[PDB]
Amino acid sequence: MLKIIIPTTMLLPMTWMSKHNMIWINATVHSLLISLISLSLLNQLGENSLNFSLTFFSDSLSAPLLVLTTWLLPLMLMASQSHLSKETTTRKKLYITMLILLQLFLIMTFTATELILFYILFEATLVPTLIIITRWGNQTERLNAGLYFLFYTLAGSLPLLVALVYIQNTTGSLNFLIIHYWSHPLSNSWSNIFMWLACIMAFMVKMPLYGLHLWLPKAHVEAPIAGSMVLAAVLLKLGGYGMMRITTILNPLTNYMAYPFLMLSMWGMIMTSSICLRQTDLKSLIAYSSVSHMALVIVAIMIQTPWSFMGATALMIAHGLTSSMLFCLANTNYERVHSRTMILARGLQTLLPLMATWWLVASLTNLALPPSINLIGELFIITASFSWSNITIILMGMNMMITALYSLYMLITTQRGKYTHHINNIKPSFTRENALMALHILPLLLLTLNPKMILGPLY
Amino acid sequence: GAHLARRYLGDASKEPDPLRMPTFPPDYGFPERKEREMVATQQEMNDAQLMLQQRDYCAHYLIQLLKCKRDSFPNFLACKHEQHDWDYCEHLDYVKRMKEFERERRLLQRKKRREQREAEMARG
Amino acid sequence: EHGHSKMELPDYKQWKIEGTPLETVQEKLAARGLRDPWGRNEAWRYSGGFANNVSFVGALLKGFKWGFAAFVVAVGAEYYLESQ
Amino acid sequence: GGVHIEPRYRQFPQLTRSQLIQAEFFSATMWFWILWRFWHDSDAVLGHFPYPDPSQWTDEELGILPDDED
Amino acid sequence: AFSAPAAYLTHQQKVLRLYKRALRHLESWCVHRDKYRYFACLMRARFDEHKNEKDMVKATQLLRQAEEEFWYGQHPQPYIFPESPGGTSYERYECYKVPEWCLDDWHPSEKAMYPDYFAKREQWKRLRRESWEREVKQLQEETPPGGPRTEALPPARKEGDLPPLWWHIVTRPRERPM
Amino acid sequence: SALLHSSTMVVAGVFLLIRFYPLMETNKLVQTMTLCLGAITTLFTALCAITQNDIKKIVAFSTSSQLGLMMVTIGINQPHLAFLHICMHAFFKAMLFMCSGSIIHSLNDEQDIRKMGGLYKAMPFTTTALIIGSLALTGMPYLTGFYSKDLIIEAVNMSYTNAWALLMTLIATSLTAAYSTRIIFFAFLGKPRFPPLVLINENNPLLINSIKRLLIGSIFAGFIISNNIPPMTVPNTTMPLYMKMTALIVTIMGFMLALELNNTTYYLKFKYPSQTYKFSNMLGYYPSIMHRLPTYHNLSMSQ
Amino acid sequence: SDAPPLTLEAIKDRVLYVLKLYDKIDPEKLSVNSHFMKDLGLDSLDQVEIIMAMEDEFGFEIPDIDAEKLMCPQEIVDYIADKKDVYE
Amino acid sequence: SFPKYKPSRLATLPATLDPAEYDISPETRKAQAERLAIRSRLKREYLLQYNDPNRLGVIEDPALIRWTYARSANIYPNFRPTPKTSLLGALFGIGPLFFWYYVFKTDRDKKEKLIQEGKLDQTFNISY
Amino acid sequence: PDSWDKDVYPEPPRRTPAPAPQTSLPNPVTYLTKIFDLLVDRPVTLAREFIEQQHAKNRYYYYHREFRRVPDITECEEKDILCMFEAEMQWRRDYKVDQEIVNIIQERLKACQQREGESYRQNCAKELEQFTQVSKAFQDRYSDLGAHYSARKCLAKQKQRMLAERKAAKEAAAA
Amino acid sequence: GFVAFMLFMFWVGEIYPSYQPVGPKQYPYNDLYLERGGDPTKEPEPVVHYEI
Numbered sequence A: 001m002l003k004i005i006i007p008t009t010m011l012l013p014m015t016w017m018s019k020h021n022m023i024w025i026n027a028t029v030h031s032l033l034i035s036l037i038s039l040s041l042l043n044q045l046g047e048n049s050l051n052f053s054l055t056f057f058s059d060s061l062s063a064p065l066l067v068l069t070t071w072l073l074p075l076m077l078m079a080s081q082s083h084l085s086k087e088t089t090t091r092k093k094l095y096i097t098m099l100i101l102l103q104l105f106l107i108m109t110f111t112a113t114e115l116i117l118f119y120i121l122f123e124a125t126l127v128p129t130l131i132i133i134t135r136w137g138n139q140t141e142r143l144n145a146g147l148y149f150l151f152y153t154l155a156g157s158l159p160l161l162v163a164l165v166y167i168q169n170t171t172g173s174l175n176f177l178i179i180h181y182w183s184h185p186l187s188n189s190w191s192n193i194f195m196w197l198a199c200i201m202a203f204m205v206k207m208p209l210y211g212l213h214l215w216l217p218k219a220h221v222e223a224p225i226a227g228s229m230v231l232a233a234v235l236l237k238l239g240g241y242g243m244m245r246i247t248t249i250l251n252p253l254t255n256y257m258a259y260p261f262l263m264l265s266m267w268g269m270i271m272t273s274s275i276c277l278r279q280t281d282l283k284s285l286i287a288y289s290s291v292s293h294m295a296l297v298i299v300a301i302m303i304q305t306p307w308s309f310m311g312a313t314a315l316m317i318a319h320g321l322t323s324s325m326l327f328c329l330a331n332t333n334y335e336r337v338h339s340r341t342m343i344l345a346r347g348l349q350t351l352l353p354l355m356a357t358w359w360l361v362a363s364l365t366n367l368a369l370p371p372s373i374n375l376i377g378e379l380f381i382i383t384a385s386f387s388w389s390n391i392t393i394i395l396m397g398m399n400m401m402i403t404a405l406y407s408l409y410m411l412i413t414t415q416r417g418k419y420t421h422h423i424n425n426i427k428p429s430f431t432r433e434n435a436l437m438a439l440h441i442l443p444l445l446l447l448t449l450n451p452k453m454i455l456g457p458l459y
Numbered sequence B: 001g002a003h004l005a006r007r008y009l010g011d012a013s014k015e016p017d018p019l020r021m022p023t024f025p026p027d028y029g030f031p032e033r034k035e036r037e038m039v040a041t042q043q044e045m046n047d048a049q050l051m052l053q054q055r056d057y058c059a060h061y062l063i064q065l066l067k068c069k070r071d072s073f074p075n076f077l078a079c080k081h082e083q084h085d086w087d088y089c090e091h092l093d094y095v096k097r098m099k100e101f102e103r104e105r106r107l108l109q110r111k112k113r114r115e116q117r118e119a120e121m122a123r124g
Numbered sequence C: 001e002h003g004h005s006k007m008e009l010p011d012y013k014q015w016k017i018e019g020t021p022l023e024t025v026q027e028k029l030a031a032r033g034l035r036d037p038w039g040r041n042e043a044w045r046y047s048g049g050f051a052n053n054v055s056f057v058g059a060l061l062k063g064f065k066w067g068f069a070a071f072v073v074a075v076g077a078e079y080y081l082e083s084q
Numbered sequence D: 001g002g003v004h005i006e007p008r009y010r011q012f013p014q015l016t017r018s019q020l021i022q023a024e025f026f027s028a029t030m031w032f033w034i035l036w037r038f039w040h041d042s043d044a045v046l047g048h049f050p051y052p053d054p055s056q057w058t059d060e061e062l063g064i065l066p067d068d069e070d
Numbered sequence E: 001a002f003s004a005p006a007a008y009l010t011h012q013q014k015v016l017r018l019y020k021r022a023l024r025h026l027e028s029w030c031v032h033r034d035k036y037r038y039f040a041c042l043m044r045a046r047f048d049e050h051k052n053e054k055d056m057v058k059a060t061q062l063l064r065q066a067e068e069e070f071w072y073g074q075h076p077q078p079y080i081f082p083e084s085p086g087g088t089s090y091e092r093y094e095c096y097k098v099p100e101w102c103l104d105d106w107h108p109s110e111k112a113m114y115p116d117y118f119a120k121r122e123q124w125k126r127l128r129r130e131s132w133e134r135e136v137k138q139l140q141e142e143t144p145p146g147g148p149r150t151e152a153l154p155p156a157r158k159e160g161d162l163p164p165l166w167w168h169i170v171t172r173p174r175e176r177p178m
Numbered sequence F: 001s002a003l004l005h006s007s008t009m010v011v012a013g014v015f016l017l018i019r020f021y022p023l024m025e026t027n028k029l030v031q032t033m034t035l036c037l038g039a040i041t042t043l044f045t046a047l048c049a050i051t052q053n054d055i056k057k058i059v060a061f062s063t064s065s066q067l068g069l070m071m072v073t074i075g076i077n078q079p080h081l082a083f084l085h086i087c088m089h090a091f092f093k094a095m096l097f098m099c100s101g102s103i104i105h106s107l108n109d110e111q112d113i114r115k116m117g118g119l120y121k122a123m124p125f126t127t128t129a130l131i132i133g134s135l136a137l138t139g140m141p142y143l144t145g146f147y148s149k150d151l152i153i154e155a156v157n158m159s160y161t162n163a164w165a166l167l168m169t170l171i172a173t174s175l176t177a178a179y180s181t182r183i184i185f186f187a188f189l190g191k192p193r194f195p196p197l198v199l200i201n202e203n204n205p206l207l208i209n210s211i212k213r214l215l216i217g218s219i220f221a222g223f224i225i226s227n228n229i230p231p232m233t234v235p236n237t238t239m240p241l242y243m244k245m246t247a248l249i250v251t252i253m254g255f256m257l258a259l260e261l262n263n264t265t266y267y268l269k270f271k272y273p274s275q276t277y278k279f280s281n282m283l284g285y286y287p288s289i290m291h292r293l294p295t296y297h298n299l300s301m302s303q
Numbered sequence G: 001s002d003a004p005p006l007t008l009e010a011i012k013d014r015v016l017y018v019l020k021l022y023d024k025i026d027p028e029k030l031s032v033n034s035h036f037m038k039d040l041g042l043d044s045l046d047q048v049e050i051i052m053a054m055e056d057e058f059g060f061e062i063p064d065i066d067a068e069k070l071m072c073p074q075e076i077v078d079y080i081a082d083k084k085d086v087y088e
Numbered sequence H: 001s002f003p004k005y006k007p008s009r010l011a012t013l014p015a016t017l018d019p020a021e022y023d024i025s026p027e028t029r030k031a032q033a034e035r036l037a038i039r040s041r042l043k044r045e046y047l048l049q050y051n052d053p054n055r056l057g058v059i060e061d062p063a064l065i066r067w068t069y070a071r072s073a074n075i076y077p078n079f080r081p082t083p084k085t086s087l088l089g090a091l092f093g094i095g096p097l098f099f100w101y102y103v104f105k106t107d108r109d110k111k112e113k114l115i116q117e118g119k120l121d122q123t124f125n126i127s128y
Numbered sequence I: 001p002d003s004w005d006k007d008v009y010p011e012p013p014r015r016t017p018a019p020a021p022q023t024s025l026p027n028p029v030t031y032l033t034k035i036f037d038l039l040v041d042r043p044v045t046l047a048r049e050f051i052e053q054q055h056a057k058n059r060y061y062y063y064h065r066e067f068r069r070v071p072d073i074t075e076c077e078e079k080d081i082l083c084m085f086e087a088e089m090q091w092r093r094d095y096k097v098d099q100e101i102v103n104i105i106q107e108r109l110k111a112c113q114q115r116e117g118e119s120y121r122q123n124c125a126k127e128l129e130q131f132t133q134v135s136k137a138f139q140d141r142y143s144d145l146g147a148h149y150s151a152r153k154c155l156a157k158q159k160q161r162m163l164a165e166r167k168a169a170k171e172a173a174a175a
Numbered sequence J: 001g002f003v004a005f006m007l008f009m010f011w012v013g014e015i016y017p018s019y020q021p022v023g024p025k026q027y028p029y030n031d032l033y034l035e036r037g038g039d040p041t042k043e044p045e046p047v048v049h050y051e052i
């Protein structure tokens, strides 16, 4: 596993020793090479796992997330290249350092053979994200946003730590393999109920759950474009990975305890999809769409069936790519208009046709058009939930309809109609932005050719 | 249909219900009670794999119509005699079904009249 | 290649209410003391090739005569051929 | 791909003889087809097999005894 | 559309508008030309009976029962011209209308073709640059104090002057750009 | 509108029920629901059609009525006949849309029939093509619509179905004849009503060839396909004489009734419309209420 | 489309044609600049009917606010040219 | 007389059927005049900013900023706990959750009872 | 074709009729298939022959991996991790094999349904019964383990089912 | 009113259907017992079809 970790660490001295006008080129080239190296982890087995050492192991749940994490960094650099032009070299290097530290923390988090190491890195991801949000954000609300994004997380994660050490005092180990092989049923007791809650809520706050989703619109709207991408694409999936890893020790208490969270997610996907219909903000709309999709992923994980796990894995990967692309498109609009309001810049298909094509493809893949992997995950989760209970289909159909409605609403409001007359500073799209959208969208349509690569360890 | 009018605006007991027909034993009318005949056996009618609803007593003419349609293919108007034969066989089947309907109706009317006569005799 | 042939407008004195249902409208309007000031403007709709109309059944029977002639010719040929 | 025809301004538009002859030919063809099919196959509209009258069937063929045997 | 609106509609304007609407909807009801002509002269005769009416209270009582009568018999599916705000081609070509300033963002290789057009465009830009500086002072001196009361713009009064705020009225894309 | 929303895409749902006919035939409740849905759809859409002024709207409502008839055919457990109707309707409805588009283009993008008058002589090829298409749609013996629609009517009459469904199917056939003759009368027969500058022109080989290919189709395809496909269902060989002609007599009765009702528009008499006309013209008021009451009550809540 | 590119002369010709078919107007006394209210003694209703005639002749509809202030054939021609973007 | 048109929320009163416009008073005329004056002042400001050749970028609109700020960031500071607000929040935020919980719990209880008794006929049910 | 076993994927003898031309009119199908053969099948066959001889010029082989049998979860001590690991791996391999067996039976069923045409309800009862039995066995083995399934959970389910079976048999005998 | 009348009339038509003066269709081999479901090892009750 060190063949990926060491180059990521070496990205820092190279960035700090690079010439004042060659930081972006070096960082992009070497990040792309690191992603190419990380592609080798996709060769998994139907047997246990890829146990590299006592500290790091891989899995077909970990490998797609690792590949996405490595692939996201060059796109983040390419999108940050624009608005950091008037920045001093030291501060640009600091921004790249924050991105590299975030990538290293995520890489070490996703392997993490042990639960306390997983917790340490899972919280270590907080600091670079907080600094990025609160230092390179534009508005005055960023500070407030940062506070929310911090404390919510800790409010869920400090109990988890307690539970974790408690488990190591009883079981004797926190290794994932030993935990799986020596798992014992949880007696239906109040102590076990609160242990379940402590183990679960830390990851449910990061998805986020419908009741605990308030920090996400603030953090997404206020963060810079790279922060928004890393929040929507990878950081939301940490909670799903944690629940998938930790639900093994919670059986059979999950059957009773899952009802409140299942109700919250099944109604919150409808609520947030309806919220998306009446939104004056593009970033807020994309954030609420992310909330709805992760509510569906929460339902999938809670149902705890093989089809649920496969669909959840596919949906996390697909949503990461799609949400990052949508945020990039909105940022390209904002860098021209400087307002970030949907209704102001209109009729953009007439002025930027290729960007309109990118918008159409992104909206189609967010709308879960088959045979995209978005649709594969959606359909697998829906089938598993139907097997769970036949009345879920009503809520899922409502969610699908509202999702299509608000996706096409966002596309039509910005791309179609008549252009705003007084807005005259809309320059032709650059090669950088078009390449960014192409690099976002091509992996999705390539992955729809080989879905089993992102269907998880239960395939 | 006129039978619908007679059943829905008249009384129910005079005319049959198509769901439960027949409600009387076959040889209740006459005792010889000949059996319906079949030409196509199981094997060749399965081999021609006609359809489940097409496997009736008129199957043989359908077999020959299909044989014509397969043999003289480009001349799709060559074999018209067999279409007429199959139509005639289905016509005979439908006529027999109508005769069965009328026979059941007349038996029901006769039973009602016999019951009324018995009731009148008891009353007197 | 476009239609640049310098088309000239017809004579305005050509259009007369006479011979059209606009006359009948004028006669009914005179019985109450009224007159139409735009009667001649709409006369061209009844003047040229638009003067002669066709009925619904006539429209349905667009090619019945030729079809019937061909039908009888073909029937005669078939009758004279099969009788051999 | 057609020929040059100029607007008319309140007169009947110019007619090409080709379109008139084609339309008349197709209408005549349709009517000839209808008449030919009616002559050769008149039974698809009028019906070939007579509809039997249930009231004309005697009680002997229908299995009816004179109300005293059974 | 082109002319500026007024603060209110006078009585005669309302009467003329109702006459227009009633005639259009009667034409929609009466498909054929002779029938429409007959009923249109009848409606005009019914209109002109109260032409010389002088009581303004009675005049307001009139035209109001008339609007109610029109609303009762208003032909729920009236004929609309194709390019009118209800027509089937109202904004068909609005997607082909591109702003003039987009030409400033063209590549020099694109401007290499059509050189005469861009020369004339440069002349237009020079004219606009001078005329706007004249127009600002013209409008500032001509405007009443406290702000305008009607959104009507004055014409040019000098020799080399141009009408104030002319650029975006003259340089409309087209009615059918493509 | 001619390719997607008239003949190919819209039949897809019907085609879906044709794909699962082994399972549809083993359930009686779903069959009854399909039959009732088809009957109400065809009746309502024909009722809306008989009073429209946009030609494209009339043809679209005709398409919806035909889809309802296909659903009725599926509901009476006759899927192959529904497929045959799909195939014939493709031809003649596509041609009808071609003719409507030709009329629209020749009249400077004018779609209202109130502004098109005498086109029987002004444009003869479109006239004859649309006449042939209308005769195929209403059902003329031995045309392409005959081999499908006549069998549909016979099967519906000869089956253990709803009385209401049969009644609505017959009324829908009469209304089909009604809107066909409405289009003919208000687009081809009267005096011209378009703007004075005449730009009528058909002499383009593309339009003529495209229309004439579908003309040959709508004339001969029904016969050739019906006589070339193998038999897949038992026929209604013996049938009452009066009920054998019911589809016909309904068609002519609708023809004459709508023709007589249209001929009174020439009279110099005017009256305000009734409630039935208003209900039929505004599409049963369904698009109004259902596009204002739910959406608002949704969107408001969403905020 | 295949619509000939109408010109100012054609527009003026059609406007004068429609006005000359208006029998309330003596054709030999009308002119391009002839006023409607005073030079021709026409009512306001007559002016609106002329607006109907122009609308039905040219196939597009003039808004009431613009139409009610059109009193000469020349300015009607100019308005229609401005609407239709006529070069010459 | 004719049947009366009854306005509704989703089908408002026609402009020409209002009782208000027919009642004209000098005060109403002054109100209309000053409304047109405000509209014309705004239009003049916008057109002066719009026709400027030196102008680049977007003409910032205070009304749009006010609209977005009032819709998003002015809600909670102006919020007040009220019986209407408390009741509506409790209903719309709790009732759906408990309703759906009751529905799903009842459905799964029936399913569990049926599978316990064995009369569920789960043949060919292999993927879940 | 020798590429697959005929016993694992059985097929009927595939009897086909003989052409019986009742008319002298020449059908378009035979001429069309002859011209198709000449214009398509021959060049494809020649290209395949070239490719096959090129493959024959370079021949190499690969082998199907064989796995030894290992003590299963029943012969494992309560906390001895090595034997539990081996038993779990063996159980997962057996699970995959059973999945493939069910796949094979389903393929048989689908091929039957398509092949027998209009008489599939009667001519494919054997495959239906085979799939019913195999599905019943597979469902008894793995129906309700859920995610995080293990050999221990499967063994516990089997023990519960066999305890129920033993109790039912005892009650029936003692009824 | 239109929708409610439609629903009520469809229910009424379901309660009073339309059919023909014919008996049930007759199928030869024990109502096609062997080729509809199969199960040949049970020998069902034979059915005799009337000749008329």
Ligand SMILES: CCCCCCCCCCCCCCCCCC(=O)OC[C@H](COP(=O)([O-])OCC(O)COP(=O)([O-])OC[C@@H](COC(=O)CCCCCCCCCCCCCCCCC)OC(=O)CCCCCCCCCCCCCCCCC)OC(=O)CCCCCCCCCCCCCCCCC
Residues within 6 Å of the ligand: F050, F051, F167, F170, F171, F174, F175, F178, F179, F182, F250, F254, F257, F258, F261, F265, F271, F272, F273, F274, F275, F276, F277, F278, F280, J001, J002, J004, J005, J006
């Ligand atoms: C068993 C024996 C078999 C033989 C049976 C007898 C033989 C035939 C006898 C004739 C029977 C009637 C035929 C004439 C139809 C009427 C035509 C007519 O005069 O229209 C002008 C006239 C008014 O015209 P207007 O307003 O002055 O328009 C001005 C211009 O003319 C505007 O004109 P435009 O230029 O705009 O367009 C003209 C257009 C515009 O005209 C229209 O507005 C059409 C609207 C009415 C005609 C539609 C009749 C179809 C009825 C379907 C009903 C389905 C159930 C609905 C249930 C609703 C529940 C509330 O008219 C047309 O295009 C032609 C109209 C259609 C006639 C051709 C086909 C109809 C015959 C088939 C009907 C039944 C026979 C079935 C055949 C099989 C044998 C079983 O229409 C009527 O007065 C309506 C008469 C009948 C309507 C019945 C519905 C009334 C419902 C009231 C409430 C009832 C209580 C419900 C309680 C619910 C509480 C829960």
Ligand SMILES: CCCCCCCCCCCCCCCCC[C@@H](O)O[C@H](CO[C@H](O)CCCCCCCCCCCCCCC)COP(=O)(O)OCC[N+](C)(C)C
Residues within 6 Å of the ligand: A188, A189, A190, A193, A210, A211, A212, A260, A261
């Ligand atoms: C804010 C947005 C959402 C945030 C996250 C919300 C999700 C967390 C909700 C936790 C789920 C429920 C907690 C406990 C569930 C146990 C089941 C219990 O509720 O049912 C009955 C329990 O009865 C009563 O519920 C007893 C508890 C009553 C006191 C709890 C407070 C109830 C409402 C408080 C909700 C506030 C949550 C947020 C706190 C800040 C069953 O009766 P009994 O058989 O005897 O108990 C079985 C359990 N045993 C065997 C261990 C004994």
Ligand SMILES: CCCCCCCC/C=C\CCCCCCCC(=O)O[C@H](COC(=O)CCCCCCC/C=C/CCCCCCCC)COP(=O)(O)OCCN
Residues within 6 Å of the ligand: A152, A155, A156, A159, A162, A163, A166, A190, A191, A192, A194, A195, A196, A197, A198, A201, A205, A212
């Ligand atoms: C996003 C913000 C939400 C915050 C998360 C809140 C949920 C977490 C649950 C609250 C904290 C509990 C931590 C428990 C740590 C696990 C250890 C454990 O479970 O062991 C139990 C310990 O169980 C407890 O002590 C629980 C006591 C809880 C004290 C603090 C309560 C905090 C508030 C609880 C109310 C909220 C409950 C639902 C919260 C859901 C989130 C909103 C057994 O103790 P022993 O004595 O060693 O066993 C021997 C006897 N059988």
Ligand SMILES: CCCCCCCCCCCC(=O)SCCNC(=O)CCNC(=O)[C@H](O)C(C)(C)COP(=O)(O)O
Residues within 6 Å of the ligand: E011, E012, E013, E015, E022, E025, E026, E046, E047, E048, E049, E050, E051, E052, E053, E054, E058, E059, E062, E063, E066, E067, E069, E070, E073, E074, G043, G044, G045
């Ligand atoms: C199908 C829809 C039905 C519609 C029904 C409509 C009802 C029709 C009946 C209308 C009733 C009236 O006349 S309402 C009568 C209202 N009262 C007056 O009109 C008095 C003074 N009239 C004017 O001043 C006008 O402007 C005038 C002199 C006409 C022109 O002036 P010009 O010199 O500047 O052209």
